Design a binder for these strands. Structure first.
Lengths: 205, 56, 293, 170, 159
RNA sequence: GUCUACGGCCAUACCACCCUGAACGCGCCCGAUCUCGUCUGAUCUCGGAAGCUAAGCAGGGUCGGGCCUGGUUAGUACUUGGAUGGGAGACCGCCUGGGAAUACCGGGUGCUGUAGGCU
RNA sequence: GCUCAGGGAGGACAGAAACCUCCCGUGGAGCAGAAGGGCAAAAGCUCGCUUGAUCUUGAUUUUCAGUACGAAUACAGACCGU
C-alpha cells in the first residue's frame, strides 16, 4: 500500500522532477494518457468537454489513472466503442519523498522517492473528452463521476473550441472552406500567407 | 546540546545606531600604489621647478 | 532519410563572425597586438605600415588606429612608378622596393624630415636601420602589418620594408626573411639581396629563356618586348627610378571630372511593387487553371 | 557555344594501397606506387586500435600518392585500359568525383620484381573546373557557387564523351 | 556553510550574452582612461586575466593610476558596519566610461553659456532643476463629439 | 552611381536558389629560372598578362528561413505597501504604486571612418 | 600551419567497423581531473625553437578582525626565451 493523499496534497516544495540528481523513482500508475478512438478526424468529433481545476493542489498519478478508467468505462457504456476520445492533460512529473523509519531519529531525514504526483494550477484543465454534439449529456456525467476520484474542487466546461483545436466552433468549417485550416489527423494545421508561393499554388491545386 | 548556527538579525539595527560613516574624502589623496616609473619622473619634475623660476 | 543540420533552430542559435573575418581579410588575433596602445601613452598614435600584394599591384600605407576607423596618413601604389621609369614588372621585388622607398620619401616630405634623415643612398641590402640625430626631430618609428601572407624568406612585403628602411623609416626588423639568407648556413649574403633589389633574378630568367626558347620567352615576357626593356636596361631602369623618387616624391592628385550621374545598378524594389507582383502571380495562376480544366 | 572558363580538368588522381599490416611488408608496398607514378608516396598511421582485423594505434598500415597535371591523365589511361573503358554508374560520386580499384598491379605496365608480389590499389579522380581553387586560399576564400559545381550526371556524361567509355548499370 | 572562493556564484554574472560570444571588439582597448574619470566595473568571462571580484561587478569608482594594460579604480565597498573606499587593479576589458558624468558636464557648459549670454541685459535665466510641477489649468475641447460611455463587461468563463 | 587598401559598430550585414554586372580595380587565369615549401608548384612562395565574367565579389529578386523592429497577447501573469478583509483551509478579492513573456499580425533587410581610383 | 564531434556519398580484398577523396558541419569536439564559465586563421590538433616554472623590492585583491597562511591581480629594476 501507501500513505493518504492528505500528506502530499498541497504544492509545498519546489518542483523536484525525475533527473540525474533524483534517480531511484518508481514508474507512474498513469502511463496511457489518451484513449477511446484516438485515430479520429477533427470534423467527426465537433463537441469538446473539459474538467477544469479550482485549487492550487498536487493530484496523484494513481488518482489520474483511477479518474481515466472511471470516465473511460462510463463513456464506453454510454456512447460505445468508437464515439469519443479522452486525453488526461496532467503528466505526473513531481517526485514526492518519504523519510522511511524501518531506529534512527531525525539525524539527516531526507526522503527516498515514494512516487510521482501531477502538480496543478487554478483554471488548468485536468482531463478533456471530445465527441459528437449528440453526446453532450454523457461527457458531463463522465467528468462529473471522474471528480469523485480527486481531492479539492473540480469544475466542468463544454468549450467553444472545435474538439482538440485552437479555433472556435463557429469559425472552423468556414475557415476550412476558405483553406486557412488543414485537417491533420486529430488536430488542424493553420497555414498563413507567409511561406513561398509554391505552397499556395499546391494548396489551390 | 545543539545551538543556533548563524543569523544577521539585530545587525542592520546595530550598524545604523552610530550611523554608517563614509570614508574621510579630502583634496590631495596620497600617491601610494601609483606606477613608480611615473612617480619617480613626477618627483624629478617637482625637484626641477626652481630652474625655470625667472621666466615664471 | 537523415537529420537536416541547418535547422530553423541552427539559424536562431547561429552567431555570425566579424565582417572582415567573414569576407576573409583581417586577422583580429594579429590586429589586437599590432594596433592597440599602452594605456600610459594616451592618444600617442601607434603607426603601422600596411603592405598588400594583389595580382597586378602593391599597396603600401601608413595608418594609426582610432575608434571611428584607422586613419591612413600616406599611401604609395605600384601604378605610380610609371611616372618615375618602371613601366612593366609591378608585382616583383624591385617594384616592392621602389613602392616602400616612395612611401618613406612621401611621408618625410609631408612632415618636413626629407633633408634630415636622407637614408641609405647607395643601395646594398646590408643590415641598415635609421639612427635619430641630436637636436633634430626623432625618426618615424612604424611596425610592419604583414597581413595574412605567409612571411617566408624573400616575401615581397620585406622588399617594401627594405625600401622604407633605406628611405628613412625606423622599422624594427632582422635580416632572417630578406633574400640571400641561407637557411642551413644561417648567415646573410647581402649581394643576393642586392641582385633581387636591382631585379637581376628577372634579367637572369630573361637570358635563360632568350638562350633556351625565344617562343617560351614571347609567352612569359610578352609586355617587356612591347616597351623593349632588356636585361642590361634592367639595373639602370631601377637605379634611375630610385633617384627620380628621392628627387620628387610629392603626389599630384588626379583631378575630378563632371558627373552625368547615370546609374548602372538595379534600385531596391518598393513594398507596393512587391505586393502587386504577388497579386499578379496569384491572379495569373487561376487565369491558367480555368482555361486548362 | 560554351564558356571556356567552364571546362572540366582532373584536379588530382588519388592512389592508395591499404595493406593493413606494418614493417618491411609495407616498405615493398611503396615501390609499386613510386614505379607507377614516378614520385615518392607517403605512409598513413592507423587511426585507432581495432584487434579484429589486426591493426593498433599509430602503426603504419597504408601507403598513398596524389598525382596532379599531365601525368594524372597518363596513369588514369592505363587504369581504364585494364577496365576496358567500362565503369558502373554507382562509381560516380554525388559531388562530381569518381573512382575504381583494379585487382592486379602489373596490368598497368610494371614488371614483377620477384617477391615484390601482388598489390591492388584505389584510383580516385577529383574532377575540377577553372576557379575551384578559391575554397583553399589564405585570402578572401568562398563557396564556388551552385551553377559552377559538378553533378553526377555531368561527371558520367564527361566519362561517356572523353574516353568513349560505356557506363553499364550495376 | 557555503564554499568560499573567488568565482562562486559568478555563473550568469561573468558569462557572455546570447550571440555575443567569441572575439572582443577592439574599440574596448582604444578608449582613453585618464586619472580621475569615473568608471563602472563589469567583469568579462572571455578575458580571464585581471578580473574584478564579484563584490565590484556593477559598482562605479574613479581612476587613480593607469599602467600599460590595466587601471586602478577606487570603489566604495560596504562590509558589516562601515564603507571602505579601496584600491583595485582591474584590466580595461572589465571597465567602461560611466555616462553619469556626461550629463553633468553638459549641464555645467550649457549652465555657463546661459551666464556668458544674458548677464548684461537684465533678463534673469533660471538655471536650477525643478521637479515636474503640478499641472496647469487648460480647456479639454470636445470637438463636436460627446464622450463614449464605458460600462464593465459581464463575466464569461474562458478556458 | 561605384570599387580598392586599411577599418569602426559586428546577421537591417547571415543562409538557400535565380537574374544582371559599363570603366578602372579585385579576381579567376598562365607558368616554376631565381626566392620558398610540399608525396604532389593543389595550398604556400616566386616570375608573369594569352584569355574569361564561369566562379569569388558587387547590385537586385523571393506571399523565402533567420535577424531587427512595432502591434497584439494584456493592464493579463507577477509584484511594493495596507487592512480586527473573505475562507475550515488551499488560496482569493479590494485599496495604494509598478508592470512583463510566446503563439498570432504588420514594417524593414547594413550604417559609416580615412586614403586612393572609375564614371 | 591547419580545424573539431557527427553525418551524406564514393572507392581492390574491405564488411557495422583498417585506408583514401569530396561535400555539409556555431562547437553538437578538445582543453589531465569534479562542476560552472570561457575559446574556431584559438585557449583545440600538428610541427619548430626554448626555460618568464629564474633573481629582487614595495603596492593591491580574495577569506577578513579588515589579522596571518594559501592563492591571485597590476607595476617597477635585472637577466633571458620566442
Amino acid at each position: 500500500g501507501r500513505r493518504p493523499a492528505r500528506c502530499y496534497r498541497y504544492c509545498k516544495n519546489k518542483p523536484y522532477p525525475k533527473s540525474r540528481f533524483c534517480r531511484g523513482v518508481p514508474d507512474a500508475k498513469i502511463r496511457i494518457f489518451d484513449l477511446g478512438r484516438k485515430k479520429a478526424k477533427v470534423d467527426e468529433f465537433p463537441l469538446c468537454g473539459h474538467m477544469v481545476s479550482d485549487e492550487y493542489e498536487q493530484l496523484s498519478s494513481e488518482a489520474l489513472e483511477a479518474a481515466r478508467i472511471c470516465a473511460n468505462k462510463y463513456m464506453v457504456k454510454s456512447c460505445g466503442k468508437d464515439g469519443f476520445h479522452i486525453r488526461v492533460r496532467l503528466h505526473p512529473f513531481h517526485v514526492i519523498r518519504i523519510n522511511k523509519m524501518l531506529q534512527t531519529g531525525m539525524r539527516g531525514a531526507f526522503g527516498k522517492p515514494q512516487g510521482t504526483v501531477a502538480r496543478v494550477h487554478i483554471g488548468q484543465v485536468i482531463m478533456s473528452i471530445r465527441t459528437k454534439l449528440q453526446n453532450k449529456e454523457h461527457v458531463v456525467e463522465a467528468l462529473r463521476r471522474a471528480k469523485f476520484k480527486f481531492p479539492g474542487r473540480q469544475k466542468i466546461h463544454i468549450s467553444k473550441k472545435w474538439g482538440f483545436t485552437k479555433f472556435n466552433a463557429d469559425e472552423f468549417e468556414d475557415m476550412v472552406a476558405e483553406k486557412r485550416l488543414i485537417p491533420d489527423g486529430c488536430g488542424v494545421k493553420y497555414i498563413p500567407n507567409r511561406g513561398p508561393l509554391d505552397k499556395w499554388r499546391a494548396l489551390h491545386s | 546540546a545543539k545551538s543556533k548556527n548563524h543569523t544577521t538579525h539585530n545587525q542592520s539595527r546595530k550598524w545604523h545606531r552610530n550611523g554608517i560613516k563614509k570614508p574621510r574624502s579630502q583634496r590631495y589623496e596620497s600617491l601610494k600604489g601609483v606606477d613608480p616609473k611615473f612617480l619617480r619622473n613626477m618627483r624629478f619634475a617637482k625637484k626641477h621647478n626652481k630652474k625655470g623660476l625667472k621666466k615664471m | 532519410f537523415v537529420k537536416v543540420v541547418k535547422n530553423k533552430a541552427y539559424f536562431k542559435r547561429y552567431q555570425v563572425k566579424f565582417r572582415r573575418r567573414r569576407e576573409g581579410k583581417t586577422d583580429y588575433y594579429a590586429r589586437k597586438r599590432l594596433v592597440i596602445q599602452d594605456k600610459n601613452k594616451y592618444n600617442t598614435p601607434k603607426y603601422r605600415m600596411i603592405v598588400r600584394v594583389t595580382n597586378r599591384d602593391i599597396i603600401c600605407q601608413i595608418a594609426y588606429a582610432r575608434i571611428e576607423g584607422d586613419m591612413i596618413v600616406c599611401a604609395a601604389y605600384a601604378h605610380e612608378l610609371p611616372k618615375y621609369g618602371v613601366k612593366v614588372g609591378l608585382t616583383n621585388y624591385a617594384a616592392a622596393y621602389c613602392t616602400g622607398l616612395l612611401l618613406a620619401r612621401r611621408l618625410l616630405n609631408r612632415f618636413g624630415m626629407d633633408k634630415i634623415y636622407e637614408g641609405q643612398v647607395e643601395v646594398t641590402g646590408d643590415e641598415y636601420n635609421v639612427e635619430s640625430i641630436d637636436g633634430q626631430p626623432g625618426a618615424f618609428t612604424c611596425y610592419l602589418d604583414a597581413g595574412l601572407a605567409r612571411t617566408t624568406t624573400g616575401n615581397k612585403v620585406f622588399g617594401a620594408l627594405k625600401g622604407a628602411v633605406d628611405g628613412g623609416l625606423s622599422i624594427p626588423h632582422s635580416t632572417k626573411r630578406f633574400p640571400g639568407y641561407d637557411s642551413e648556413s644561417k648567415e646573410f649574403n647581402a649581394e643576393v639581396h642586392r641582385k633581387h633589389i636591382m631585379g637581376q633574378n628577372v634579367a637572369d630568367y630573361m637570358r635563360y629563356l632568350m638562350e633556351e626558347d625565344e617562343d617560351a620567352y614571347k609567352k612569359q615576357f610578352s609586355q617587356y618586348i612591347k616597351n623593349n626593356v632588356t636585361p642590361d636596361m634592367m639595373e639602370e631602369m631601377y637605379k634611375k627610378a630610385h633617384a627620380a623618387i628621392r628627387e620628387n616624391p610629392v603626389y599630384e592628385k588626379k583631378p575630378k571630372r563632371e558627373v552625368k550621374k547615370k546609374r548602372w545598378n538595379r534600385p531596391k524594389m518598393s513594398l507596393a511593387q512587391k505586393k502587386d507582383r504577388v497579386a499578379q502571380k496569384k491572379a495569373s495562376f487561376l487565369r491558367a487553371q480555368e482555361r486548362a480544366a | 557555344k560554351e564558356n571556356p572558363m567552364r571546362e572540366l580538368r582532373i584536379r588530382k588522381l588519388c592512389l592508395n594501397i591499404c595493406v593493413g599490416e606494418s614493417g618491411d611488408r609495407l616498405t615493398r608496398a611503396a615501390k609499386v606506387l613510386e614505379q607507377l607514378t614516378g614520385q615518392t608516396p607517403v605512409f598513413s598511421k592507423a587511426r585507432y586500435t581495432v584487434r579484429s582485423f589486426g591493426i593498433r594505434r599509430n602503426e603504419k598500415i597504408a601507403v598513398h600518392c596524389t598525382v596532379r597535371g599531365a601525368k594524372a591523365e597518363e596513369i588514369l589511361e592505363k587504369g581504364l585500359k585494364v577496365r576496358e573503358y567500362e565503369l558502373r554508374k554507382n562509381n560516380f560520386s554525388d559531388t562530381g568525383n569518381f573512382g575504381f580499384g583494379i585487382q592486379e598491379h602489373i596490368d598497368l605496365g610494371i614488371k614483377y620484381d620477384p617477391s615484390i608480389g601482388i598489390y591492388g590499389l584505389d584510383f580516385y579522380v577529383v574532377l575540377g573546373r577553372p576557379g575551384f581553387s578559391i575554397a583553399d586560399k589564405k585570402r578572401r576564400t568562398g563557396c564556388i557557387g551552385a551553377k559552377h559545381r559538378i553533378s553526377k550526371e555531368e561527371a558520367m556524361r564527361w566519362f561517356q564523351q572523353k574516353y568513349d567509355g560505356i557506363i553499364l548499370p550495376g | 556553510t557555503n564554499t568560499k572562493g573567488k568565482r562562486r556564484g559568478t555563473r550568469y554574472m561573468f558569462s557572455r550574452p546570447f550571440r555575443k560570444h567569441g572575439v572582443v571588439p577592439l574599440a574596448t582597448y582604444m578608449r582613453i582612461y585618464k586619472k580621475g574619470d569615473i568608471v563602472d566595473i563589469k567583469g568579462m568571462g572571455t578575458v580571464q586575466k585581471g578580473m574584478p571580484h564579484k563584490c565590484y561587478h556593477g559598482k562605479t569608482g574613479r581612476v587613480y593610476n593607469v599602467t600599460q594594460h590595466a587601471v586602478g579604480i577606487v570603489v566604495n565597498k560596504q562590509v558589516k558596519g562601515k564603507i571602505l573606499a579601496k584600491r583595485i587593479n582591474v584590466r580595461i576589458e572589465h571597465i567602461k566610461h560611466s555616462k553619469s558624468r556626461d550629463s553633468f558636464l553638459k549641464r555645467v557648459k550649457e549652465n555657463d553659456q546661459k551666464k556668458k549670454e544674458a548677464k548684461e541685459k537684465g533678463t534673469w535665466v533660471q538655471l536650477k532643476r525643478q521637479p515636474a510641477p503640478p499641472r496647469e489649468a487648460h480647456f479639454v475641447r470636445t470637438n463636436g463629439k460627446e464622450p463614449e460611455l464605458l460600462e464593465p463587461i459581464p463575466y464569461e468563463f474562458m478556458a
